[PDB]
Design a protein around this ligand. Structure first.
Ligand SMILES: NC(=O)c1ccc[n+]([C@@H]2O[C@H](COP(=O)([O-])OP(=O)(O)OC[C@H]3O[C@@H](n4cnc5c(N)ncnc54)[C@H](OP(=O)(O)O)[C@@H]3O)[C@@H](O)[C@H]2O)c1
Ligand SMILES: NC(=O)c1ccc[n+]([C@@H]2O[C@H](COP(=O)([O-])OP(=O)(O)OC[C@H]3O[C@@H](n4cnc5c(N)ncnc54)[C@H](OP(=O)(O)O)[C@@H]3O)[C@@H](O)[C@H]2O)c1
Ligand SMILES: NC(=O)c1ccc[n+]([C@@H]2O[C@H](COP(=O)([O-])OP(=O)(O)OC[C@H]3O[C@@H](n4cnc5c(N)ncnc54)[C@H](OP(=O)(O)O)[C@@H]3O)[C@@H](O)[C@H]2O)c1
Ligand SMILES: NC(=O)c1ccc[n+]([C@@H]2O[C@H](COP(=O)([O-])OP(=O)(O)OC[C@H]3O[C@@H](n4cnc5c(N)ncnc54)[C@H](OP(=O)(O)O)[C@@H]3O)[C@@H](O)[C@H]2O)c1
Lengths: 235, 241, 228, 230
């Protein structure tokens, strides 16, 4: 076919999709025609989305959340690891706890979901693991020794998973957004490093996720898709 | 806002859209709903698309092509610099001519089209400059001193253009494909027979439609905040630093 | 001025410098003229170098290790975070425990030393934080979801540290070795590297010739990790 | 295994554009290391402290004769430092074909001419160090540099295609990418200063030493962290 390939309704799970960027991702994938499930830490999801409670720092809860999703919409085919936190501080001011808590949620939590999803993904010969990284992973925003390390670790993990599982139809990619609006960052002068001279919207991030979850990205593995308006350009 | 944004039919120009990857890009963008024009060198436009004869090594011809496209479908809003060639040789065997003609077509030829389009793109506060690079730009396929230099140069040019014009709604990005199947017959791919699959984690070559899928995303409304990016369509082949 | 800059003896700490690549780095920096200390886990440092007992998974041991180094040879000016482990497994067979202990040693362990070192480096306006990464960080060696994440995480941490502290003379860089003798189909050099070659790149990042280098990934891999 | 610095080996060095600027500092450093250093010039005359040959990197015949004169004076080139380069900045709308191609022919194609001319004897001798002088703008993309950034980014792709082909024969190709070197930009420089020519020459001395045999296709940024990104 010359046009867009035929659409396939995928079983989607968006971790941390109860608000913010994760909510816009989940609603975009639902409007695309997918079967979208989201996770929350207890407060619940909006009415328009199927929600399950899950803390990505608890391996038993991650396995428990996948069980509900498999029972509701089938085994997860597209994982969007979006849950994450930030604990910024100067290097000498950053404690061990504020470092490990960012690592455990942003890095290790994304591994727990990708490992739990890889079971059915290998047997069904299909899988889309989409980590939500950040420009800070390769650009290195100051006062983010923990956040920049976790977001950069997503690139290494996604590429180690891709080099193993791409032959079995399972790819792992990373969406790296810049400053996204969901104002103090603008007051501190963040616009000076963004060539687009504006912040991105959550819907623009969801547009990149919708691409990686569609039938137009089956030959894309280990990629870092920057949604930063040119902020993270470099090496 | 929640779903896919409202579609805008863009004036599209695809260099080298008569065969290969460029033909798939032109057909995909037309099926998306864009006003698609292609450049050729005598064969003419495919399907019902609009065609202009243009060799990207001739600035006078590039200006002439943009003038005819402007009259037919309005000024070019989305440029897909797809025209390219290859002249492989060992470093000690590569001549000055075979190095420069690859540079003049793949790198300079992309500049001629990108420079010619920038004027109206800055007027209308919109512009999508999509370069068709290669995995060899950053991965460095052997015997490609000229080809890898031209494809890597597309990244630097796209990022210099983006840092200057992204504030005016004009962005430049690069699609870097890996080994893509462009065979017209059932014959075996000679690159595959040479062991190309040993470097592709996907263990298969890509299709021209998959590259066109990546170009369709960059030309759509879902990529307005993407500038200076390299989109690898290589099955994980070019992973590294 | 035109030649090599005048040498300055720095206080060096090399984590895990009792054997392997860390030992070759310590001997190289000692031969350069640095005051070289190394951390061990009870095996004892070679009688040629100053040794402190430290497990990089323990913040209290890290704080005590730097404390003993400051009293002996002055506060650490050049930190070489070399201590690291590997626990490979297929993604479907890698456990949470196997993932976290690789992260805790390679990534979090390197942060504990860098965070402790920045206490005195930032005040004296000189600092060289040199992380020993791996080609797998950006190349993504298979069966290393934990290892590649930790090694790629060193890049983001070094660049975040650099953007904050480069203005104060404190820089952070990563040395990313390939396969080092202590697979050749992806190595253009068609051979493996040696520990002395890794130590040669560390010697450069710890010398007076690398004061303007920050957030850099220096690959010592024979070209294996070329890409993007 | 030797624990200290490896025994120094004096190489035959050629530094293009080593008559002034960064190239002059690179050549004086490599000569101070112990190498036999020759530089290229374009009639102004090499400085009184270095052997000079006349060569315009846009002329393949002049490059061929330059390596001939270097070989007759100090042996065939073992370490090549492609330093010659120009910049013709302009906005994209204002950049002409002549202005674009002039920067490409000198910075990119001129680096290929020297790299091609030295490649054969490097392969036969099983040793070769091709060091291209790139720029932060290659991967960072400084504005008004559609020609300069394309040329400096092309040096990376060429060096990596050369390395993947010839690293097995002991011939590596690397790129030193300096930031702003003194020979409003401080906002993007985490070091909050500009570099010196001696700091770029220090990185070249490393890539030309016995401590960089296992480094191929690398980009060594000397920018104070300016080009950090992806
Ligand atoms: N400018 C930006 O906002 C920006 C830029 C680049 C990257 N990102 C990344 O994009 C992702 C979301 O962006 P955002 O703007 O929406 O920030 P956010 O609002 O703080 O997103 C956090 C989400 O993750 C969930 N979550 C947090 N910790 C969790 C845990 N331990 N277990 C399970 N779920 C957990 C939260 O649920 P609760 O509501 O219950 O806490 C919430 O849904 C993050 O990973 C962030 O790093 C954001
Ligand atoms: N595996 C792959 O195929 C692969 C991988 C990575 C990147 N790419 C890139 O993708 C693009 C197209 O790939 P392809 O496989 O389809 O190549 P192709 O089949 O040989 O066709 C390339 C097109 O470029 C046109 N062209 C060449 N030189 C031109 C010039 N000076 N002026 C104008 N048009 C010119 C050709 O027109 P004519 O018919 O008149 O010759 C043809 O339409 C190239 O830039 C290539 O580098 C390809
Ligand atoms: N091919 C390679 O060798 C290669 C390639 C790329 C990168 N690297 C990196 O280079 C570094 C060293 O390489 P290697 O070959 O020398 O490995 P190695 O021979 O196994 O030595 C590892 C060193 O780290 C120490 N260590 C490990 N975990 C520690 C902890 N929790 N606390 C304190 N010290 C700890 C070990 O101390 P003990 O003696 O008590 O065990 C030992 O001194 C590692 O970070 C590795 O990832 C190696
Ligand atoms: N901020 C910086 O300075 C900076 C930053 C990044 C990279 N670089 C790179 O560093 C290198 C050194 O340049 P520079 O900073 O020292 O400025 P420069 O003073 O203008 O040096 C340019 C040198 O290149 C020679 N040259 C130019 N075109 C030539 C040609 N066609 N054939 C032969 N030689 C030619 C010049 O010789 P003549 O005397 O005859 O003109 C001169 O020796 C350049 O390649 C530049 O791109 C510089």
């Amino acid at each position: 076919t010359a046009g867009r390939p035929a659409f396939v309704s995928r079983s989607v799970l968006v971790t941390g999709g109860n608000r913010g960027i994760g909510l816009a991702i989940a609603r975009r994938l639902a409007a695309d025609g997918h079967k979208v499930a989201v996770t929350h830490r207890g407060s619940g999801a909006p009415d328009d989305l199927f929600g399950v409670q899950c803390d990505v720092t608890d391996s038993a809860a991650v396995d428990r959340a996948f069980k509900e999703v498999e029972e509701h919409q089938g085994p997860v085919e597209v994982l969007v690891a979006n849950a994450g936190i930030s604990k910024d501080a100067f290097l000498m001011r950053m404690t061990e706890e504020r470092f490990e808590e960012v690592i455990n949620t942003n890095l290790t939590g994304a591994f727990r979901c990708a490992q739990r999803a890889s079971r059915t993904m290998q047997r069904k010969r299909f899988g889309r693991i989409i980590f939500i990284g950040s420009v800070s992973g390769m650009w290195g925003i100051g006062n983010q020794a923990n956040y920049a390390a976790a977001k950069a670790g997503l690139i290494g993990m996604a590429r180690s998973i891709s080099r193993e599982l791409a032959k079995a139809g399972v790819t792992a990619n990373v969406v790296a957004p810049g400053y996204i609006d969901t104002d103090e960052r603008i007051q501190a002068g963040a616009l000076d490093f963004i060539p687009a001279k504006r912040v991105g919207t959550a819907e623009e991030v969801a547009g990149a996720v919708s691409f990686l979850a569609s039938e137009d990205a089956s030959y894309i593995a280990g990629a870092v898709i920057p949604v930063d308006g040119g902020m993270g350009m470099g090496h």
